[PDB]
Amino acid sequence: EFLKPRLVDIEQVSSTHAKVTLEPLERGFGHTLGNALRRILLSSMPGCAVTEVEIDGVLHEYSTKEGVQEDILEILLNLKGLAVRVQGKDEVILTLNKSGIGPVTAADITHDGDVEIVKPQHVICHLTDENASISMRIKVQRGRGYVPASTRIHSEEDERPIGRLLVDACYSPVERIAYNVEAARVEQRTDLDKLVIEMETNGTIDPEEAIRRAATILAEQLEAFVDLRD
Template sequence: MLRRLVNYLDGKWEGVMIKAMKDFQIPMRVEVDKDTLSPTYGRFTTEAFERGFGTTIGNALRRVLLSSLTGAAVTMVKIEGVVHEFSTIPGVTEDVTAIILNIKSLRLALHTDKPKTIRLKKTGPGEAKGSDIVHDADVTVLTPDLHIATLDKDATLDIEMTVKHGRGYVPAERNKEEGLPIGVIAIDSIFSPIRRVNFHVENARVGRMTDYDKLTMEIWTDATIAPRDALSTAAGILREHLDIFINPEERGEGKPEAGREETQREVNKHLSRSVNELELSVRAANCLKNANIKTIGDLVQKTEGEMLRTKNFGKKSLNEIKEILAEMGLSLGTKLDAGQSHNGGPKSE
């Protein structure tokens, strides 16, 4: 015990860490409940943890899932004939405050890094819904049945909305930009693609011992991210934040982050590989061939919107490719710098 303490004080972290890890019961895999898995729900179970670690890990993942994943939301609106959010619109049942409240519940997928403008123009009588919104292929409305407003006969509602990427909850004050035209109203934005997260811990058995933890995570999303990808992303965010505590003195001196560099090298190795090496369905493979996408490096630089505009390329093929890329630590919409392109091999012409 004393030797271990001396090692710690001397900064010999590695030996202490190896010994500590050997003393701990570490789960080796995550089981996915395939019977209930859907684009919006996932149930994941892992065991066995040392007593107490199930709650520690479950709570940390839950907090990151709810607060730190990137999503898309409306950040500003411009309603024809309206100067401020406390106005009313002739022939429209809801006032502007109520309309904005409904717009906050709009769930969207944004397939580009750039802000996009979408528009709702409706003439009464009738109900204005999410399905009435006009947009291009870079935006998908996931709540087409969402009620936005009720219009009387001869009433007209014309709304322009700005959609951006963000994380968590952002109040209207932070969405305001300098020099906004009169009539543009910044609104509160809920970017999180996670609708709900539950976790529970129960006893697990290892040999004769039953005082270990079994952790079950339940994740509900808005379909812009698969529950499996959401869990993986949250775990990655936690790992990035905890890395600094491994050999902190070396990090403080600005020494190379060997673990992260090794991970980046592994990722770069994939970039020069041919897409023919991926185990894709015939349809997906043919679509990539027709789009002249030859390497994985070519593929990851495409956005979801660009892929969906490829002839005969649909959501099923998109999800197939996203899942395969995720297994390699890659994703669509990645911007590669010159160094990455070089390390990953020459880009296709």
């Protein structure tokens, strides 16, 4: 009686924005499945984020380097917005080295084969001196949700190296999820709906793999409810 929703064209408005649509969805499943997927996506999606920053010259967050137009604090706040993905391994260490004047952008980072900068025009900082040179080592690792500045320090019992910069890692690859239920017309029966999901992400996850991850997590959650253990 119940049809099975099928993946149809997943258009790309941009790298960040994509529309994913599910055509054969039965009555009373439009908003239900939409809320399901939206909550899963905004709540639990793997994402690559910066955790630790090692600028060569400065000693602490509030110490400002000579030559740059920006506080090290603002450099970290821009490093948060780094749109990066790693799919060869869980935790990698990017390296950036740039001298001379100009805007130090993400594209200048020495990338490996397993690391992709999906936003290679991201203005990391502004170097305003010929003599001044910026040397960054950025730790980028996989994770989920949001990890505020309070937890990994317990995984190492204080940052033994000094000059290490701790950054609130926001691994959420997605930033906007919206669902619309529209009257789909198909020869089979008379009442079915397109579920059209707009998703604005940081360009680090494919919409297909994203929806697949969300569905897999939802199925794992429903595992217990399908078979009640008591």
